[PDB]
Design a protein around this nucleic acid. Sequence first.
RNA 1: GUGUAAAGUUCCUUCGACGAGUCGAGUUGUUUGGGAAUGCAGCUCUAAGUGGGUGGUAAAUUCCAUCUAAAGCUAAAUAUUG
RNA 2: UGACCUCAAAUCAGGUAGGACUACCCGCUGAACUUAAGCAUAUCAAUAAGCGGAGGAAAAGAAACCAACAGGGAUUGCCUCAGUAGCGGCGAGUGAAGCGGCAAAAGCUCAAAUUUGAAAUCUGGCGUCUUUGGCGUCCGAGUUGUAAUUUGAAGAAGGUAUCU
Lengths: 148, 53, 203, 191, 97, 52
Amino acid sequence: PTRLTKTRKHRGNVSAGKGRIGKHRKHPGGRGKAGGQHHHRTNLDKYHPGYFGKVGMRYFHKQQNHFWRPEINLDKLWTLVDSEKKDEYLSKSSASAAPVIDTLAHGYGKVLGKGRLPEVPVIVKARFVSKLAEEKIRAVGGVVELVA
Amino acid sequence: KKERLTKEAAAIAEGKTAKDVSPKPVVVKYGLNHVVSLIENKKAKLVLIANDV
Amino acid sequence: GAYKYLEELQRKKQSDVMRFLYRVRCWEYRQKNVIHRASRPSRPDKARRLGYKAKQGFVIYRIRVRRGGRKRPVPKGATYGKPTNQGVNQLKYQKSLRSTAEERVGRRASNLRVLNSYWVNQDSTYKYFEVILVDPSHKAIRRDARYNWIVNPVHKHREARGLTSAGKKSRGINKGHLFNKTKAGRRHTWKKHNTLSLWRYRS
Amino acid sequence: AISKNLPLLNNHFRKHWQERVRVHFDQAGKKASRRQSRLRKAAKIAPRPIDALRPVVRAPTVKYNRKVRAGRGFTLAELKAVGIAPKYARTIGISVDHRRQNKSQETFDANVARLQEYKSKLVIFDKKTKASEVASFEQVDVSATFPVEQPAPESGLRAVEVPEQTAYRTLRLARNEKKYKGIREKRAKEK
Amino acid sequence: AKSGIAAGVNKGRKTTAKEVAPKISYRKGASSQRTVFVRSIVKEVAGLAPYERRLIELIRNAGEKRAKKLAKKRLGTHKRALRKVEEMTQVIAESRR
Amino acid sequence: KTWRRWNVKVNHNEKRYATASAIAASAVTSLVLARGHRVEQVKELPLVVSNE
RNA sequence: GUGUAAAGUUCCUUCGACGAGUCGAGUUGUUUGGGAAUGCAGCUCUAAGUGGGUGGUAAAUUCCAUCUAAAGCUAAAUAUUG
RNA sequence: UGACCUCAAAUCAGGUAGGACUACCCGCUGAACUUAAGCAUAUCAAUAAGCGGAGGAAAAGAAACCAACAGGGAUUGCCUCAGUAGCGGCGAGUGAAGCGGCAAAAGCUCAAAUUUGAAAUCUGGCGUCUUUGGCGUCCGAGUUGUAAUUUGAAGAAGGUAUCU
Ligand SMILES: CC[C@H]1CN2CCc3cc(OC)c(OC)cc3[C@@H]2C[C@@H]1C[C@H]1NCCc2cc(O)c(OC)cc21
Ligand SMILES: [NH3+]CCC[NH2+]CCCC[NH2+]CCC[NH3+]
Ligand SMILES: [Mg+2]
Ligand SMILES: [Mg+2]
Ligand SMILES: [Mg+2]
Ligand SMILES: [Mg+2]
Ligand SMILES: [Mg+2]
Ligand SMILES: [Mg+2]
Ligand SMILES: [Mg+2]
Ligand SMILES: [Mg+2]
Ligand SMILES: [Mg+2]
Ligand SMILES: [Mg+2]
Ligand SMILES: [Mg+2]
Ligand SMILES: [Mg+2]
Ligand SMILES: [Mg+2]
Ligand SMILES: [Mg+2]
Ligand SMILES: [Mg+2]
Ligand SMILES: [Mg+2]
Ligand SMILES: [Mg+2]
Ligand SMILES: [Mg+2]
Ligand SMILES: [Mg+2]
Ligand SMILES: [Mg+2]
Ligand SMILES: [Mg+2]
Ligand SMILES: [Mg+2]
Ligand SMILES: [Mg+2]
Ligand SMILES: [Mg+2]
Ligand SMILES: [Mg+2]
Ligand SMILES: [Mg+2]
Ligand SMILES: [Mg+2]
Ligand SMILES: [Mg+2]
Ligand SMILES: [Mg+2]
């Protein structure tokens, strides 16, 4: 709403909050990112270091579908088990019958190894796993089954 | 051709196949595509080619 | 038939026979008017390939179009701008000489629809084209189920709108990534990519 | 022109952008008219469904392998497997795609089952058919009657079987073999 | 057919292969008796191009490397130059009887 | 300009929150009276009538 | 209705024509996000028959994948200061 | 004494084109002010002005496509991809596409084939009728190719079990 703006409060005061000396002007300093190497260097060097220059190699026609690989950690791995059967699986799970967790079918590409698992065997199906994630899954008596 | 077709329609009126009433034609073949295919199929005995094509 | 032989022989353009025929026909076409009516296709096979039929209502014009680039038609070469726009020579027209041939022929025979065209011969000063046109008011065309379509008014001066084979070639109307800018029309694509789309509930 | 600790922006408004501003004031009007077109098209041809039966196909790319969606048309092999000619199929509400082929058996079998299910529910009228029988039918929605269903992810209990080689080691060895396959083959050929 | 894992050579999910009937469009490059015959008659009627005769002279004068460089300069690509030089050597072999 | 913002988005859950609050407020006699409704001769709120 | 017609359907054999100053190449100018060159155009060169095109780093060698150019028509969803 | 080819003439029989409108559409041609705190590449902008051509939509369109998958499957538009890959005195700036969700969905036609036991094709004149046309007849076009048959998804020619 305009009735809440300071334009309504500046009415009657000559300069509208812009100053009598400075005199709000069109474009003092240039337009946009002008002078980034000359008179706005003190700003870009302080707040955006690394702005100028090239780093790394180009990649013509980069298709981001190639690099799709969402991560799921181990402390979040048991959320893919059915909620209505999680407590039963956590109790009655054994080497003879352990829950299967299909991470790809839930939308994940790599299993990472942050956190701690319940000391309960699981069968984890993944496209990729980290070394520690698979070591921790095997330690609770589980296994990682690679899929594609 | 009109007279031949009239005869064949008379024969089909009589109940005949219209192929018996008309003898097999022995005529000159013409048409460039037709004659070229006849030569390629070794069916032409003699070809006369115009000199001003 | 003979059309296969005609096709294979026109591909040997540097053979003695074809060179002789091209010399003689280039002289004759240069001796005629810039635009003239051809009593028949000089390449019946090529005309067949391009939609010509030996019927009443199909017409052939031969036309002669000057070769080379497009000199900028500014007086004394002064462009009055920035140095990037100071070129006068070595500039090129964005349409082909085939398209220019089609458009001038269609302008001359304004009662016909330009169906298509083909190259016939060439020298240093001219390229020679034969343009296949169709009469939309002829009943042999109007009652032909394969050629009624060109009687409809959306095909008025299709050669002037780039809807012939040469025109679509110069417009870049092809499928794939090499034609991203021009697949559905260059200016349409630019307008689409430069339009600010605002919805009622802004996202 | 540049001031404070603020993000650097890319506001592409240096052309005559205000001449190409499309505001969708007609969103509700287009919704309503779109609904009316949809009702008229359905009532014109009732009880024939407005949607042709579409196949089920795997989505391309490594990112959408898992998903399965509606394709464009059933392949000629699939229609051959259910004994329908494509020319006839286009006239009984089945979509045909001459471009798609069946390298693998799974999608082929899924679409053959889908075609056989549609064929069992199909009822083709004729001259002998009366309006009482035609009125005995309701216009179904084919897209909902034969929905595209994602295969269920494997879940439940299964025996744990631990190979001697870890999965991480398997992936590392596969990467190494792919990376050095060419140079190793060249070395073996030279040797 | 696939390795069943997400990395390495022949990566990807295993599927049951189904034999695919080849499309007729894939026969496009194949030659036919009609085109071989017509092209042989057209070669007899037309003859050779000037650069093709020059190629033949270089091949006769043992300039295989020169003939390759000429055929690439004329035709444009190295693959087409290789096929043209092979065709002109077969022409010489068919002209030596 | 026509590309001024005219419609405003509200979270669906918050809109439902407010709907529930208004429905609940319809059963408070003091609120209905301050709202201005001549409800002094209605014996109780909510006022429920038979399906005829 | 002139339905010994027209069309589809299974299998075997023999075949299976498929667009040239065009593709493609060089160079010049312009253009493109297209970067040893995205498209277009001029000029020079100029093909082939499992050939040809594409596979976003130029080249040769070897594979693989995918389409089938240089001819043509076609409603709807889209645009609309008249 | 006559054909054919090419080219003419006629106030010959019958037609057709031009010009107008401007919001959208298909092309050509084409700036500079401006931004870069100067300025020449760049930007404005493949925009304004100029020229040619349409329709109720236009254009595009049934892959010489996208991809690199377990593969998708004509064209168009929306949402997203994405202010991203990339381009850029790598400065100011600029900048798409594939996938994915949806709206709408619709497919096809020639050329290249000997009808060769029969140019089976078509404009026009004349006559007639039930006249957006049918029938008869006569010239003409056309074999330097008009019909039927096939369009790569195929398909053709033979044989084939018969069915719908
Ligand atoms: C001032 C408004 C005019 C001008 N504009 C713009 C351009 C234009 C172009 C058109 O074609 C390109 C067109 O075609 C219809 C109409 C218009 C309209 C016509 C309108 C008058 C017209 N309004 C409707 C009724 C009416 C009755 C009359 O007696 C009568 O007297 C002259 C005129 C009318
Ligand atoms: N878009 C209107 C301006 C035209 N200026 C042409 C752009 C020049 C830049 N070329 C990019 C560099 C080549 N990769
Ligand atoms: Mg202030
Ligand atoms: Mg002041
Ligand atoms: Mg100040
Ligand atoms: Mg300085
Ligand atoms: Mg030459
Ligand atoms: Mg004529
Ligand atoms: Mg010129
Ligand atoms: Mg100027
Ligand atoms: Mg079109
Ligand atoms: Mg092939
Ligand atoms: Mg083709
Ligand atoms: Mg250049
Ligand atoms: Mg230009
Ligand atoms: Mg270039
Ligand atoms: Mg085409
Ligand atoms: Mg209006
Ligand atoms: Mg007259
Ligand atoms: Mg300005
Ligand atoms: Mg300045
Ligand atoms: Mg200034
Ligand atoms: Mg200045
Ligand atoms: Mg303008
Ligand atoms: Mg109109
Ligand atoms: Mg519409
Ligand atoms: Mg159209
Ligand atoms: Mg096709
Ligand atoms: Mg597509
Ligand atoms: Mg730009
Ligand atoms: Mg008549």
